[model samples]
Target: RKLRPETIDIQRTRDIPDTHKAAISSLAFHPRYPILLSSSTSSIMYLHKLDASAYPTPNPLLTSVHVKRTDLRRAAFVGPDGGEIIFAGRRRYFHCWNLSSGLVKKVSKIQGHQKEQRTMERFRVSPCGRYMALVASDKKGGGMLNIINVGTMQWIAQARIDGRHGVADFAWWSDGNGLTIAGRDGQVTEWSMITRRTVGIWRDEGTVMALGGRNGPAELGGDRWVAIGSNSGILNVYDRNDLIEIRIKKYPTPTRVFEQLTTSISVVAFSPDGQLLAFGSQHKKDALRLVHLPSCTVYRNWPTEQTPLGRVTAIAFSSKSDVLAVGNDVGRVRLWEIRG
Candidate 1:
């Protein structure tokens, strides 16, 4: 049975603890459990079980782990049994925590080129769990993307971008051998993890320009599709083979330009099974839309202006795609139940 996004209603759940004090910087459904991991600006990270059925009953967290860094992100379950976790910690280091002992330790210094290394702002671990890719603004200006080993933390590959300096986000290729990075320049570059170089490139110079906020890139389950969007409210989709975008929706051209960059907290994601695509920018009525990728049609009658979600900071689908957990700036994680 397949659950359809158009038929289900998504509403705000009670919430994760708001004690973190700021934006819900990162939220992810555990890869193998009915659990979720979350963290915001306050330095305390929490783990909670999905105790609710159709609706949410916000329960006390299972455990909270403290780290030295006030800013933490890309938090994920690593280790062989998926018991341990790793995340960006103080300065340019990554810390791995053991759930059983509750001990967090520095793992490795991120590899960089300039005099002072750029702290990795956004990173993604491959689905296969073999590699990790991180993007950061270099000290010399512009940005760089680096690939590293998950187990050993060895710098395996890297690429340097000279302009816009905004490879703000990226996604792993389905095969896990490559990645796609997109940013303000309105170009998407593909890099081979093994060869350690740029393998392909796609550009849309008309929509690409300097802007206040950044949009990240996302990939479908395989090599056939990739997506990128930004403050302009335009999300360009490409085929790995054909690789040119034909408009799916008409995005209003920027009315305020500099003063208002709509997607300050932008998200472009695929459902777990990769059959659906959901995109959102912070301020538009249709700011969030779910698409049935096979047919390329907008999932109808969903998320009207009344949807309570605000300034979405992070989103993740359950491993089965049966649920969608959305976290926002206000410190709540809303759970959406999907039905066939």
Candidate 2:
């Protein structure tokens, strides 16, 4: 069975009963379980069992841990089994919470590259759980990204782009072999670990704020669809299948350019199966839209005025892609179930 093309099939389940103490900054779904991780600037990270069918509290809180004074802006599950949790803030160090042993190890240095990585505020974990890419400081003139091997915690490679303002955001290709890094100046760089070099660079329509993609093949950098969100709320969706010759392509036309929202594009996430794309902004109340894949059109029937999404700060789809999680600046985590 397939979902309705014009109207998405989604049902509001139950919002997470316990909200964060401060504004929620990030959310991550365990790749292999019913666990959902929520992080906030309150210096705490919470894990909840996403069982909406439960009677008493619905999505029950599994555990919450405090990282003392660090305001966590990014928290994600790394490794193949989602065994370790990595959280970072505007500090020089980050902590890894090992699930099996309950050991919290603080990592302060990236082997030989401390100068570039002044702060570990934001990072992205590869889909295969083999690599971790941290956004480095821009004080060195251009945008910088440091890639670290997850198991060894060693800085393996670094990508330096020509953008003067620094890196805005980056996403790993689905196969965990390459990355698509977005600069504040609207340029995107494609770097391949296999070649250890920058393979391609393309400019978006305007200043790029966020970049996200997933669920493709290794040859095309693993993600079938790449969505670029600009500062003016202009979004461009690209198909990797058409980007086979990306090196020679200079001005590739977007599969679709969306002008649904007028504020800055803060979030761009694709479903685990790459069948749905959800992009939103935190500037306006309820500034979110879900675009059904293949058709590349926004769904018209959902997110009505009754939908209580208070400044969505984070968004994540479950590993199974059946459940959608949206975290707000007001600390609420809204849940919805998608069915065919």
Candidate 3:
């Protein structure tokens, strides 16, 4: 029998500061501790204590050093052995907050190519917390990827590619030895951190919005496979081998049913166990569909009361896979449970 999904209580909700009117931009769970961090567009970050509590409401704990309206690109909880740090990025600058003390430090700020082009673009941290990568673009033609060392916050290496054609969305493999980056020009490149070279590049059929990698043998023969979603509503999967070829199995693009109804495959994610794959879409309503990877069958289709805001921005699984977190454009976040 398939497990049914139930709408768990919101736990607790805390409104962002009234002045900012920001929506939730990103959400992440602490790797070891019982804490949940939620970042909002208002340049404010909330840290909530999570336990077996009936209602878990987050409190505004830290605000970005910069008062400008910069969207929080990413928030991560560093492991204890490394340094208890919460990493957040906006524009060309990235900041790290010391969890123990309330101190926030501006780690790195790479100026844009030209004075007019000051956007910092997007950022991501390596799974192992050893490296941080940032993407910046301009009118010229190409974009640059700045790879920095986490400990010293110094630039280790840089790579430039044509941004006009390719959009760069990146994800680090669980091992942290390499990263997978996709561009709008149908180019998906995997670079090795150890060798500091481009390992492989695969071409897709359309623009790629989301990229995810799973660590398992059943999917890509021990090598992790990258799942790419596009504006055309297609979900493509590619093996991580040097050959850089896509897998034979792919999901069919769901049909767009109405004139007023717009459809898009917003985000894709794999569970930590690698047994499940989930993707979100918004037409008239927010809907999330989960698939059993081994069987490639739809497991659940859960809809939310929140209508389309922009797109499904983020999706994360609880440490135990019993709960899933879904975030959308309206700045709303929902927690769903997998029931027996």
Summarize candidate 2's per-residue lDDT along 32-145 as a digit string, tens digits: 999999888798888999887787878899898997877678888986699999888989999999988889999887766788776888788887788889877655566688
Give the poorly placed runs of model 1, Cα more than 4 Å off: 3-6, 9-21, 53-60, 79-81, 108-116, 136-142, 162-166, 205-221, 244-265, 283-286
By TM-score, the best candidate is 2
The pairs that clash in candidate 2 are 216-222
lDDT of 3 by residue, 182-301 (tens): 776666666677677666555654433333335433322344445666665556654444233233222223212111113456667776655556766553245556655444455423
- What is the Å distance of residue 171 in model 1 from its true position? 1.7
lDDT: the better of candidates 2 and 3: 2
TM-score of 1: 0.78
Candidate 1 lDDT = 0.60
Candidate 2 has a TM-score of: 0.94
* lDDT scores of the candidates, listed in order: 0.60, 0.81, 0.54
Query: Where does candidate 1 have its weakest 10-residue lDDT segment?
Result: 207-216
Q: Using lDDT, give the best candidate's number.
A: 2
Query: Predicted candidate 1: what Cα RMSD to the true structure?
Result: 6.6
lDDT of 2 at 316: 92
